[PDB]
Amino acid sequence: MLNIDSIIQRLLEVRGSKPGKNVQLQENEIRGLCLKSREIFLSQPILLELEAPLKICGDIHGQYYDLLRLFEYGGFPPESNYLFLGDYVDRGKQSLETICLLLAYKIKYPENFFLLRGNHECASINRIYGFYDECKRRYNIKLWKTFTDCFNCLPIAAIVDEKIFCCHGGLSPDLQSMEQIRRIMRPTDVPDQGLLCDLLWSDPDKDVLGWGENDRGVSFTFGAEVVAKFLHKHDLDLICRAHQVVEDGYEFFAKRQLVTLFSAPNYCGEFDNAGAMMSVDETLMCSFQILKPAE
Template sequence: MSIGGSDLDRAITQLRACRPIPENQVRELCYKARELLIEEGNVVGVDAPVTICGDIHGQFHDLMELFRVGGDVPDTNYLFMGDFVDRGFYSLESFLLLLCLKVRYPDRITLIRGNHESRQITTVYGFYDECLRKYGSANVWRYCCEVFDYLALGALVSGAATALEPTDGPIADNVTVDLPDPEQDIEIETLNANGEVMFRYARNGDSQSSATSQGNSNAASSSPVGPTPSRSGAAGTGATSSVNGSARNDTGAILCVHGGLSPLIDSIDKIRLLDRKQEVPHEGAMCDLLWSDPDEIDGWGLSPRGAGFLFGADIVKCFNYKNDLSLIARAHQLVMEGFKEMFDSTIVTVWSAPNYCYRCGNVAAILELGEDGSNAGFVRRSNGDRAGGGRGWILGSNAGPNGTSNEENRRLSSVLGESMQRPRDGPGRRYRVFEAAPQDSRGMPAKKPVADYFL
């Protein structure tokens, strides 16, 4: 048989109900997917608007919740940053559904590779066992692994707007923070699963303060912080000053990658040159992109995971500057609040598996980037303090660690030069936060979660 057209739609319907499709259909689907993926570069170009998602890990019911919260395919464009499989009970259904959607709507959905899309890791963390259990043989696992080898290593999102289109969602009940003036441009907005606004943060563009910082590398440390104490977490530093106070509404591109950076990669073009069509190696650039983590260190560090590296703010800022990026979006690390911005909002971790492993109690998030041009008449106002995205800003706390670090700014100015302290404005970022779907939902088979504890 061949999977295409109505067969494909049937398969999608079946998978949406969390029912696996027959082995021969999987084979056909994987073949089609490979044909499609082989045409993609190592770094896929993606145009905004797009919704960026982190780890899924076989939590099928939560993937359905993600689509409910974020909009369905093909109405919403999605970019999944890998780790579709392992740990959860429905890796197979989750991955095959995403793959079906990819084949059905290739321009609407982008899948890149995570460190779990690997033969070695899936034999330890569950996907292999799941395939064996559901099909009685390892064939389906093998087909899927062949697809893994063709998944892109990263994606580059361009055309994202600097300011969010305001949502008309109501304000969530428990929000006590003053929301910014509706006239102001929205840089960050957090919505709950019902579309209610939990947090909104204005981008207070200020030509004056950025002009000051231009001629004075120390201006960064002396520039005012957020306008109200409740927003001090998003304390701006010179590091996120806007450029020259000129009216501009474009933003640098956003690099999406599962893990992070590699000491062997200093430009996106170097990622493009890798030979990706292989099992994830134990070391080297490809391995690092899928395994590394940002950390509060200087430069590079050894990763406790045994693969990849740790990298500090200086590495990220340098990489973003050199590659004209405004943001790196990555997944790979569980964050209890669903997302976490670090290093003056130059990198964000997005985590999309709520109550990870049915044990961690975390919420999940997806990141929506709007399309540029929606506010073409945008003119930056000079209305006071410049307060860009914060350092280590996370949902819920609204408080970043320690505010501005003069020392870091000094260090950066010595390492990177003063111009490096003023990276591009980040894109407007709308985070939708959601909780786990109940496991006993009707109409979908669900194994009772049995999370291991020490007993």
């Protein structure tokens, strides 16, 4: 039995502190977030059907104080509805605080707050790129395994008002009907290839015609006509995805038929990129707020 309000209050009370200040929840509280959110994820569709207005965010990668700023400008739940597109953990310094706040809001406002799976919500990846280390350092191995079982139940994609298709990575040459996504059973790991892999790993590329081998070493690239055909077959207007660092936080592809969102400013302290959040209003007019890193 969670005291979700107590947990959220403690996560938010570090706002305004010198960036880097930790929240040390109890191990049992973090475990509780995982157990309860897993129930909620499994009870909801794996392909979400969402109604605007809402705000959509891309990668966070453990940049907790940047997540707090997103909420400060976007409005704290449930003032605004949110959809996050994955990659909550790794690389940044506070993956635990980040995923704990997101899971806590999912539990408190399960029909106003939504989280998709990214490719870093996968044990084979986040064992290496920082999350496992953070868990072992601050708590224990067992807690990391608990997060893994929770992540294995995240939904994979969302459609906003039957017009905006959202996922972390991108399209799949295997994908012909949305029913294929719906029939993916959870819990599941992410396979090294195939539909689920592509949805979390693939990228648009302006120089490819059709499908190409992705330079990442996983999945594919796809071109602008693949996007156009996808939108026409499924009666969609827009693909909204994340997964790539883009300099202004958002970046259009294929004459605004696809948009990439990335919400971790100055990623890894290397890229000097902005982070963006896309607001979708009830008429599906999309607008962008960006957080630009300054000295």
